[PDB]
Write a protein that binds this ligand. Structure first.
Ligand SMILES: Cc1cc2nc3c(=O)[nH]c(=O)nc-3n(C[C@H](O)[C@H](O)[C@H](O)COP(=O)(O)O)c2cc1C
Ligand SMILES: Cc1nc2cc(OC(F)(F)F)ccc2n1-c1ccc(C(=O)NC2CC2)s1
Ligand SMILES: CCCCCCCCCCCC[N+](C)(C)[O-]
Ligand SMILES: O=C(O)c1cc(=O)[nH]c(=O)[nH]1
Length: 375
Protein backbone atom coordinates (compact mmCIF):
# COMPACT_ATOMS: atom_id res chain seq x y z
CA UNK A 1 0.00 0.00 0.00
CA UNK A 2 1.19 3.45 0.94
CA UNK A 3 2.36 5.41 3.97
CA UNK A 4 0.37 8.43 2.92
CA UNK A 5 -2.79 6.44 3.41
CA UNK A 6 -1.42 5.35 6.70
CA UNK A 7 -1.06 8.74 8.29
CA UNK A 8 -4.50 9.75 7.22
CA UNK A 9 -6.03 6.73 8.87
CA UNK A 10 -4.33 7.85 12.06
CA UNK A 11 -5.63 11.40 11.76
CA UNK A 12 -9.04 9.88 10.94
CA UNK A 13 -8.93 7.61 14.00
CA UNK A 14 -8.35 10.69 16.17
CA UNK A 15 -11.11 12.74 14.45
CA UNK A 16 -13.77 10.03 14.77
CA UNK A 17 -13.27 9.87 18.55
CA UNK A 18 -13.15 13.59 19.42
CA UNK A 19 -14.35 15.84 16.61
CA UNK A 20 -17.86 16.71 15.56
CA UNK A 21 -18.84 14.86 12.44
CA UNK A 22 -19.66 17.79 10.22
CA UNK A 23 -16.42 19.40 11.21
CA UNK A 24 -14.45 16.32 10.22
CA UNK A 25 -16.18 16.31 6.90
CA UNK A 26 -15.43 19.92 6.20
CA UNK A 27 -11.92 19.25 7.17
CA UNK A 28 -11.66 16.45 4.73
CA UNK A 29 -13.06 18.68 2.05
CA UNK A 30 -10.61 21.41 2.84
CA UNK A 31 -7.71 18.96 2.41
CA UNK A 32 -9.14 17.95 -0.95
CA UNK A 33 -9.49 21.56 -1.96
CA UNK A 34 -5.85 22.04 -1.15
CA UNK A 35 -4.90 18.89 -3.18
CA UNK A 36 -3.04 17.09 -0.42
CA UNK A 37 -4.85 13.76 -0.43
CA UNK A 38 -3.08 10.61 -1.78
CA UNK A 39 -3.43 9.52 -5.41
CA UNK A 40 -4.35 6.08 -6.63
CA UNK A 41 -2.43 6.14 -9.91
CA UNK A 42 -2.96 2.47 -10.77
CA UNK A 43 -4.60 1.07 -13.97
CA UNK A 44 -7.94 -0.47 -13.12
CA UNK A 45 -8.51 -4.07 -14.14
CA UNK A 46 -10.22 -4.35 -17.52
CA UNK A 47 -12.33 -7.12 -16.02
CA UNK A 48 -14.15 -4.81 -13.61
CA UNK A 49 -15.00 -1.97 -15.95
CA UNK A 50 -18.75 -1.37 -16.24
CA UNK A 51 -21.39 0.67 -18.00
CA UNK A 52 -24.93 2.09 -17.82
CA UNK A 53 -26.16 2.30 -21.40
CA UNK A 54 -23.52 4.28 -23.30
CA UNK A 55 -21.96 5.65 -20.07
CA UNK A 56 -18.70 3.90 -19.32
CA UNK A 57 -17.05 3.50 -15.97
CA UNK A 58 -13.36 2.60 -15.75
CA UNK A 59 -14.16 0.84 -12.46
CA UNK A 60 -17.33 0.11 -10.47
CA UNK A 61 -16.88 2.37 -7.40
CA UNK A 62 -17.98 6.00 -7.21
CA UNK A 63 -18.85 8.33 -4.43
CA UNK A 64 -22.45 8.97 -3.50
CA UNK A 65 -24.22 12.29 -3.44
CA UNK A 66 -23.99 14.35 -0.25
CA UNK A 67 -20.25 13.97 0.11
CA UNK A 68 -19.08 16.85 -2.06
CA UNK A 69 -22.37 18.81 -2.16
CA UNK A 70 -20.81 21.90 -3.75
CA UNK A 71 -18.18 20.24 -6.00
CA UNK A 72 -15.34 21.81 -4.04
CA UNK A 73 -12.88 18.96 -4.48
CA UNK A 74 -13.97 16.68 -7.23
CA UNK A 75 -10.39 16.12 -8.52
CA UNK A 76 -9.01 15.02 -5.21
CA UNK A 77 -11.85 12.68 -4.35
CA UNK A 78 -11.71 11.08 -7.81
CA UNK A 79 -7.94 10.76 -7.55
CA UNK A 80 -8.39 8.48 -4.51
CA UNK A 81 -9.33 5.78 -6.98
CA UNK A 82 -13.02 6.23 -7.68
CA UNK A 83 -14.45 6.06 -11.20
CA UNK A 84 -17.09 8.69 -10.64
CA UNK A 85 -18.60 11.04 -8.17
CA UNK A 86 -22.08 12.42 -7.69
CA UNK A 87 -22.07 16.02 -6.50
CA UNK A 88 -25.00 17.70 -4.80
CA UNK A 89 -27.71 17.40 -4.01
CA UNK A 90 -27.97 20.97 -5.29
CA UNK A 91 -30.92 23.41 -5.32
CA UNK A 92 -31.59 26.51 -7.41
CA UNK A 93 -30.67 28.86 -4.54
CA UNK A 94 -28.09 28.49 -1.82
CA UNK A 95 -29.48 27.11 1.46
CA UNK A 96 -28.12 26.69 5.02
CA UNK A 97 -30.02 23.46 5.68
CA UNK A 98 -31.35 22.44 9.10
CA UNK A 99 -29.97 23.26 12.57
CA UNK A 100 -26.50 21.99 13.65
CA UNK A 101 -25.48 19.47 14.84
CA UNK A 102 -27.15 17.45 12.13
CA UNK A 103 -24.65 14.63 11.55
CA UNK A 104 -23.77 11.83 13.99
CA UNK A 105 -21.68 8.68 13.63
CA UNK A 106 -21.70 5.42 15.48
CA UNK A 107 -18.36 3.82 14.87
CA UNK A 108 -18.95 0.40 16.28
CA UNK A 109 -21.96 -0.23 14.14
CA UNK A 110 -20.41 1.75 11.35
CA UNK A 111 -23.52 3.84 10.89
CA UNK A 112 -24.34 7.48 10.36
CA UNK A 113 -27.47 9.55 10.89
CA UNK A 114 -28.10 12.90 9.32
CA UNK A 115 -30.68 15.64 9.00
CA UNK A 116 -28.70 18.04 6.80
CA UNK A 117 -31.66 19.37 4.83
CA UNK A 118 -29.90 19.99 1.50
CA UNK A 119 -27.33 22.46 2.73
CA UNK A 120 -25.59 23.72 -0.40
CA UNK A 121 -24.23 26.82 -2.07
CA UNK A 122 -26.85 26.72 -4.82
CA UNK A 123 -26.76 25.96 -8.53
CA UNK A 124 -24.90 29.01 -9.81
CA UNK A 125 -21.93 28.57 -7.47
CA UNK A 126 -21.83 24.78 -7.88
CA UNK A 127 -22.03 25.22 -11.67
CA UNK A 128 -19.07 27.58 -11.51
CA UNK A 129 -17.17 24.89 -9.49
CA UNK A 130 -18.05 22.16 -11.99
CA UNK A 131 -16.91 24.39 -14.83
CA UNK A 132 -13.50 24.86 -13.23
CA UNK A 133 -13.25 21.16 -12.63
CA UNK A 134 -14.07 20.43 -16.30
CA UNK A 135 -11.31 22.84 -17.39
CA UNK A 136 -8.80 21.10 -15.10
CA UNK A 137 -10.05 17.73 -16.32
CA UNK A 138 -8.82 18.62 -19.85
CA UNK A 139 -5.32 19.24 -18.53
CA UNK A 140 -5.01 16.40 -15.95
CA UNK A 141 -4.03 12.90 -17.07
CA UNK A 142 -5.58 11.35 -13.97
CA UNK A 143 -9.07 12.79 -14.55
CA UNK A 144 -9.65 11.64 -18.11
CA UNK A 145 -12.58 9.26 -18.43
CA UNK A 146 -13.76 10.04 -14.90
CA UNK A 147 -17.53 10.49 -14.60
CA UNK A 148 -19.31 13.36 -12.73
CA UNK A 149 -23.05 13.18 -12.08
CA UNK A 150 -25.00 15.99 -10.46
CA UNK A 151 -27.76 15.23 -7.95
CA UNK A 152 -30.63 17.77 -8.19
CA UNK A 153 -33.39 18.77 -5.78
CA UNK A 154 -35.63 21.57 -4.46
CA UNK A 155 -35.22 24.50 -2.04
CA UNK A 156 -37.05 23.83 1.22
CA UNK A 157 -39.65 26.64 0.81
CA UNK A 158 -40.16 25.76 -2.88
CA UNK A 159 -43.69 24.71 -3.72
CA UNK A 160 -43.11 23.49 -7.33
CA UNK A 161 -40.35 20.83 -7.39
CA UNK A 162 -40.42 20.80 -11.23
CA UNK A 163 -39.48 24.47 -11.53
CA UNK A 164 -36.50 23.78 -9.24
CA UNK A 165 -35.40 20.78 -11.36
CA UNK A 166 -35.76 22.73 -14.57
CA UNK A 167 -33.72 25.63 -13.38
CA UNK A 168 -30.88 23.26 -12.26
CA UNK A 169 -30.91 21.51 -15.61
CA UNK A 170 -30.56 24.75 -17.59
CA UNK A 171 -27.71 25.90 -15.42
CA UNK A 172 -25.50 22.88 -14.93
CA UNK A 173 -26.81 20.18 -17.32
CA UNK A 174 -24.21 20.89 -19.98
CA UNK A 175 -21.42 20.00 -17.54
CA UNK A 176 -22.90 16.76 -16.21
CA UNK A 177 -22.46 13.21 -17.48
CA UNK A 178 -25.63 12.33 -15.69
CA UNK A 179 -28.33 14.01 -13.56
CA UNK A 180 -29.75 12.24 -10.47
CA UNK A 181 -33.28 13.40 -9.52
CA UNK A 182 -33.40 13.34 -5.75
CA UNK A 183 -36.97 12.61 -4.59
CA UNK A 184 -35.82 10.54 -1.61
CA UNK A 185 -34.09 12.73 1.08
CA UNK A 186 -35.87 12.38 4.38
CA UNK A 187 -34.76 15.88 5.48
CA UNK A 188 -36.86 18.36 3.49
CA UNK A 189 -40.67 18.01 4.10
CA UNK A 190 -42.21 16.32 2.28
CA UNK A 191 -40.21 15.54 -0.90
CA UNK A 192 -40.46 11.78 -0.30
CA UNK A 193 -44.13 12.05 -1.38
CA UNK A 194 -42.91 13.02 -4.90
CA UNK A 195 -42.20 9.29 -5.35
CA UNK A 196 -45.97 8.77 -5.77
CA UNK A 197 -46.39 7.54 -9.36
CA UNK A 198 -48.27 10.46 -10.95
CA UNK A 199 -45.95 13.17 -9.69
CA UNK A 200 -42.80 11.08 -10.46
CA UNK A 201 -43.87 10.44 -14.07
CA UNK A 202 -44.45 14.15 -14.58
CA UNK A 203 -41.11 14.87 -12.92
CA UNK A 204 -39.05 12.49 -15.08
CA UNK A 205 -40.61 13.79 -18.29
CA UNK A 206 -39.97 17.46 -17.47
CA UNK A 207 -36.37 16.57 -16.56
CA UNK A 208 -35.85 14.69 -19.82
CA UNK A 209 -37.56 17.50 -21.74
CA UNK A 210 -35.43 20.35 -20.32
CA UNK A 211 -32.26 18.35 -21.12
CA UNK A 212 -33.36 17.88 -24.73
CA UNK A 213 -33.99 21.63 -25.01
CA UNK A 214 -30.39 22.30 -24.01
CA UNK A 215 -29.40 21.04 -27.47
CA UNK A 216 -31.80 23.23 -29.44
CA UNK A 217 -30.84 26.82 -28.67
CA UNK A 218 -27.11 26.68 -29.46
CA UNK A 219 -25.06 27.24 -32.60
CA UNK A 220 -22.08 25.02 -31.73
CA UNK A 221 -21.12 21.47 -32.46
CA UNK A 222 -21.84 18.82 -29.89
CA UNK A 223 -18.21 18.61 -29.15
CA UNK A 224 -18.60 22.04 -27.70
CA UNK A 225 -22.08 21.89 -26.28
CA UNK A 226 -21.42 19.13 -23.87
CA UNK A 227 -18.55 20.13 -21.72
CA UNK A 228 -18.57 16.91 -19.75
CA UNK A 229 -16.83 13.54 -20.01
CA UNK A 230 -19.05 11.60 -22.44
CA UNK A 231 -19.47 14.60 -24.80
CA UNK A 232 -23.25 13.76 -24.97
CA UNK A 233 -26.45 14.81 -23.19
CA UNK A 234 -26.46 13.76 -19.50
CA UNK A 235 -28.24 10.53 -18.67
CA UNK A 236 -31.21 10.66 -16.27
CA UNK A 237 -31.40 8.75 -13.03
CA UNK A 238 -33.75 8.78 -10.08
CA UNK A 239 -32.70 7.98 -6.52
CA UNK A 240 -35.34 6.13 -4.46
CA UNK A 241 -35.78 5.88 -0.65
CA UNK A 242 -36.12 2.37 0.76
CA UNK A 243 -39.05 3.35 3.08
CA UNK A 244 -41.82 2.37 0.66
CA UNK A 245 -44.64 -0.18 0.43
CA UNK A 246 -44.48 -3.15 -1.98
CA UNK A 247 -47.38 -1.66 -4.04
CA UNK A 248 -45.65 1.71 -4.19
CA UNK A 249 -42.46 -0.01 -5.49
CA UNK A 250 -44.25 -1.89 -8.29
CA UNK A 251 -45.95 1.34 -9.26
CA UNK A 252 -42.66 3.29 -9.37
CA UNK A 253 -41.18 0.41 -11.40
CA UNK A 254 -43.97 0.98 -13.97
CA UNK A 255 -43.34 4.72 -14.45
CA UNK A 256 -39.57 4.17 -14.87
CA UNK A 257 -40.19 1.82 -17.83
CA UNK A 258 -42.89 4.15 -19.21
CA UNK A 259 -40.63 7.25 -19.14
CA UNK A 260 -37.59 5.22 -20.30
CA UNK A 261 -35.36 6.48 -17.53
CA UNK A 262 -31.65 5.73 -18.01
CA UNK A 263 -31.17 4.32 -14.47
CA UNK A 264 -32.08 3.96 -10.84
CA UNK A 265 -30.05 4.61 -7.71
CA UNK A 266 -31.04 2.30 -4.96
CA UNK A 267 -31.13 3.57 -2.37
CA UNK A 268 -31.22 6.69 -0.21
CA UNK A 269 -31.11 6.66 3.61
CA UNK A 270 -33.68 4.98 5.87
CA UNK A 271 -35.67 6.11 8.95
CA UNK A 272 -36.77 2.54 9.83
CA UNK A 273 -33.76 1.73 12.00
CA UNK A 274 -34.53 1.43 15.72
CA UNK A 275 -31.71 -0.45 17.45
CA UNK A 276 -28.87 2.10 17.43
CA UNK A 277 -28.70 3.35 21.02
CA UNK A 278 -26.61 6.48 20.41
CA UNK A 279 -29.24 7.38 17.77
CA UNK A 280 -32.35 7.42 20.00
CA UNK A 281 -31.51 11.05 20.76
CA UNK A 282 -31.32 11.83 17.06
CA UNK A 283 -33.43 12.71 13.99
CA UNK A 284 -33.07 11.98 10.26
CA UNK A 285 -31.84 9.45 7.71
CA UNK A 286 -29.64 6.46 8.57
CA UNK A 287 -26.52 5.33 6.64
CA UNK A 288 -23.94 2.55 6.86
CA UNK A 289 -23.77 -1.11 7.80
CA UNK A 290 -27.34 -1.41 9.16
CA UNK A 291 -28.69 -0.18 5.81
CA UNK A 292 -26.95 -2.94 3.79
CA UNK A 293 -29.54 -5.76 3.94
CA UNK A 294 -32.55 -3.45 3.41
CA UNK A 295 -30.83 -1.79 0.46
CA UNK A 296 -29.80 -5.12 -1.08
CA UNK A 297 -33.34 -6.58 -0.92
CA UNK A 298 -34.61 -3.31 -2.45
CA UNK A 299 -32.34 -3.85 -5.46
CA UNK A 300 -33.66 -7.39 -5.97
CA UNK A 301 -37.30 -6.24 -5.98
CA UNK A 302 -36.79 -3.30 -8.38
CA UNK A 303 -34.70 -5.40 -10.82
CA UNK A 304 -37.54 -7.96 -10.75
CA UNK A 305 -40.35 -5.36 -11.05
CA UNK A 306 -38.60 -3.71 -14.02
CA UNK A 307 -37.75 -7.03 -15.75
CA UNK A 308 -34.01 -6.34 -15.54
CA UNK A 309 -34.60 -3.37 -17.87
CA UNK A 310 -33.46 -0.38 -15.78
CA UNK A 311 -29.74 -0.19 -14.87
CA UNK A 312 -29.22 0.01 -11.11
CA UNK A 313 -26.65 2.08 -9.23
CA UNK A 314 -26.23 0.61 -5.72
CA UNK A 315 -26.15 2.49 -2.36
CA UNK A 316 -25.38 1.70 0.53
CA UNK A 317 -23.96 -0.40 3.33
CA UNK A 318 -21.11 -1.19 0.84
CA UNK A 319 -17.80 -1.64 2.72
CA UNK A 320 -16.23 -4.83 1.37
CA UNK A 321 -15.61 -6.48 -2.02
CA UNK A 322 -18.08 -9.01 -0.74
CA UNK A 323 -20.70 -6.33 0.12
CA UNK A 324 -20.00 -5.06 -3.39
CA UNK A 325 -20.55 -8.41 -5.17
CA UNK A 326 -23.81 -8.85 -3.30
CA UNK A 327 -25.06 -5.61 -4.86
CA UNK A 328 -23.83 -6.68 -8.27
CA UNK A 329 -25.36 -10.16 -8.05
CA UNK A 330 -28.61 -8.56 -6.85
CA UNK A 331 -28.61 -6.48 -10.07
CA UNK A 332 -26.46 -3.35 -9.65
CA UNK A 333 -24.09 -2.37 -12.47
CA UNK A 334 -22.08 0.14 -10.41
CA UNK A 335 -21.57 0.88 -6.69
CA UNK A 336 -21.42 4.15 -4.70
CA UNK A 337 -19.66 4.54 -1.38
CA UNK A 338 -20.19 7.04 1.40
CA UNK A 339 -19.88 5.55 4.86
CA UNK A 340 -17.09 3.29 3.91
CA UNK A 341 -15.12 6.42 3.28
CA UNK A 342 -16.03 7.72 6.65
CA UNK A 343 -15.10 4.61 8.64
CA UNK A 344 -12.45 2.87 6.46
CA UNK A 345 -10.68 6.04 5.32
CA UNK A 346 -8.91 7.42 2.34
CA UNK A 347 -7.73 3.97 1.25
CA UNK A 348 -11.29 2.83 0.68
CA UNK A 349 -11.40 2.66 -3.08
CA UNK A 350 -7.96 1.00 -3.42
CA UNK A 351 -8.92 -1.55 -0.78
CA UNK A 352 -12.32 -2.31 -2.22
CA UNK A 353 -11.20 -2.57 -5.89
CA UNK A 354 -8.68 -5.30 -4.97
CA UNK A 355 -11.24 -7.23 -2.93
CA UNK A 356 -13.84 -7.15 -5.70
CA UNK A 357 -11.15 -8.34 -8.14
CA UNK A 358 -9.85 -11.12 -5.83
CA UNK A 359 -13.42 -12.21 -5.16
CA UNK A 360 -14.44 -12.08 -8.85
CA UNK A 361 -11.64 -14.61 -9.49
CA UNK A 362 -12.61 -17.08 -6.71
CA UNK A 363 -16.19 -17.18 -8.04
CA UNK A 364 -14.70 -17.77 -11.49
CA UNK A 365 -16.45 -14.92 -13.32
CA UNK A 366 -14.72 -13.80 -16.50
CA UNK A 367 -15.48 -10.12 -15.78
CA UNK A 368 -17.83 -7.91 -13.74
CA UNK A 369 -20.58 -7.58 -16.36
CA UNK A 370 -21.18 -11.35 -16.24
CA UNK A 371 -22.01 -11.08 -12.48
CA UNK A 372 -24.77 -8.54 -12.80
CA UNK A 373 -28.10 -9.94 -11.82
CA UNK A 374 -26.83 -13.43 -11.33
CA UNK A 375 -28.92 -13.47 -8.22
C1 LIG B 1 -24.31 13.40 5.66
C2 LIG B 1 -25.04 12.83 4.48
C3 LIG B 1 -25.48 13.67 3.46
C4 LIG B 1 -26.13 13.12 2.35
N1 LIG B 1 -26.57 13.92 1.30
C5 LIG B 1 -27.21 13.34 0.22
C6 LIG B 1 -27.65 14.12 -0.81
O1 LIG B 1 -27.45 15.33 -0.77
N2 LIG B 1 -28.29 13.55 -1.88
C7 LIG B 1 -28.50 12.18 -1.96
O2 LIG B 1 -29.08 11.69 -2.95
N3 LIG B 1 -28.08 11.40 -0.92
C8 LIG B 1 -27.44 11.97 0.16
N4 LIG B 1 -27.00 11.17 1.20
C9 LIG B 1 -27.22 9.68 1.12
C10 LIG B 1 -25.93 9.06 0.55
O3 LIG B 1 -25.71 9.58 -0.75
C11 LIG B 1 -26.02 7.54 0.48
O4 LIG B 1 -27.06 7.22 -0.38
C12 LIG B 1 -26.34 6.86 1.80
O5 LIG B 1 -25.43 7.29 2.78
C13 LIG B 1 -26.23 5.35 1.74
O6 LIG B 1 -24.88 5.00 1.52
P1 LIG B 1 -23.88 4.38 2.59
O7 LIG B 1 -24.54 3.29 3.39
O8 LIG B 1 -22.70 3.82 1.81
O9 LIG B 1 -23.37 5.47 3.49
C14 LIG B 1 -26.33 11.75 2.27
C15 LIG B 1 -25.90 10.93 3.31
C16 LIG B 1 -25.24 11.46 4.40
C17 LIG B 1 -24.77 10.52 5.49
C1 LIG C 1 -12.09 9.85 5.12
C2 LIG C 1 -11.36 10.77 6.04
N1 LIG C 1 -10.08 10.85 6.46
C3 LIG C 1 -9.91 11.88 7.30
C4 LIG C 1 -8.87 12.42 8.02
C5 LIG C 1 -9.10 13.54 8.80
O1 LIG C 1 -8.10 14.07 9.53
C6 LIG C 1 -7.24 15.01 9.03
F1 LIG C 1 -7.90 16.05 8.78
F2 LIG C 1 -6.69 14.55 7.99
F3 LIG C 1 -6.31 15.30 9.84
C7 LIG C 1 -10.35 14.10 8.88
C8 LIG C 1 -11.42 13.60 8.18
C9 LIG C 1 -11.21 12.50 7.40
N2 LIG C 1 -12.08 11.84 6.61
C10 LIG C 1 -13.49 12.00 6.67
C11 LIG C 1 -14.22 12.33 5.57
C12 LIG C 1 -15.56 12.45 5.89
C13 LIG C 1 -15.84 12.22 7.22
C14 LIG C 1 -17.06 12.25 8.03
O2 LIG C 1 -16.99 11.97 9.18
N3 LIG C 1 -18.18 12.63 7.52
C15 LIG C 1 -19.30 12.87 8.35
C16 LIG C 1 -20.55 12.68 7.54
C17 LIG C 1 -20.10 11.60 8.50
S1 LIG C 1 -14.42 11.86 8.06
C1 LIG D 1 2.28 18.92 1.40
C2 LIG D 1 2.96 17.60 1.71
C3 LIG D 1 2.58 17.03 3.07
C4 LIG D 1 1.85 15.69 2.95
C5 LIG D 1 1.91 14.88 4.24
C6 LIG D 1 0.56 14.33 4.69
C7 LIG D 1 -0.23 13.88 3.49
C8 LIG D 1 0.72 13.41 2.42
C9 LIG D 1 -0.01 13.19 1.11
C10 LIG D 1 0.57 14.08 0.05
C11 LIG D 1 0.13 13.65 -1.33
C12 LIG D 1 -0.16 14.92 -2.09
N1 LIG D 1 -0.11 14.50 -3.43
C13 LIG D 1 1.16 14.89 -4.00
C14 LIG D 1 -0.27 13.07 -3.52
O1 LIG D 1 -1.01 15.05 -4.02
O1 LIG E 1 -29.39 16.78 2.63
C1 LIG E 1 -29.86 15.86 3.33
O2 LIG E 1 -30.27 16.01 4.51
C2 LIG E 1 -30.01 14.49 2.78
C3 LIG E 1 -30.35 14.30 1.43
C4 LIG E 1 -30.52 12.97 1.00
O3 LIG E 1 -30.84 12.72 -0.18
N1 LIG E 1 -30.34 11.96 1.88
C5 LIG E 1 -29.98 12.21 3.17
O4 LIG E 1 -29.81 11.26 3.98
N2 LIG E 1 -29.82 13.46 3.62
Amino acid sequence: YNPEFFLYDIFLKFCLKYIDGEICHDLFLLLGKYNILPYDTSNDSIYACTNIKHLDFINPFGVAAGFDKNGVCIDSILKLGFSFIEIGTITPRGQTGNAKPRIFRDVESRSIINSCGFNNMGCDKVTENLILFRKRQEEDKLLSKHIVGVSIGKNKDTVNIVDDLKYCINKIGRYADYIAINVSSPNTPGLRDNQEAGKLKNIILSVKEEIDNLEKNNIMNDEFLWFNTTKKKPLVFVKLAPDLNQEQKKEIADVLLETNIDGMIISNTTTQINDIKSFENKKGGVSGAKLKDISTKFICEMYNYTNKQIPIIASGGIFSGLDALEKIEAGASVCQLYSCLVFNGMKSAVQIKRELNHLLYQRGYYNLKEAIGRK
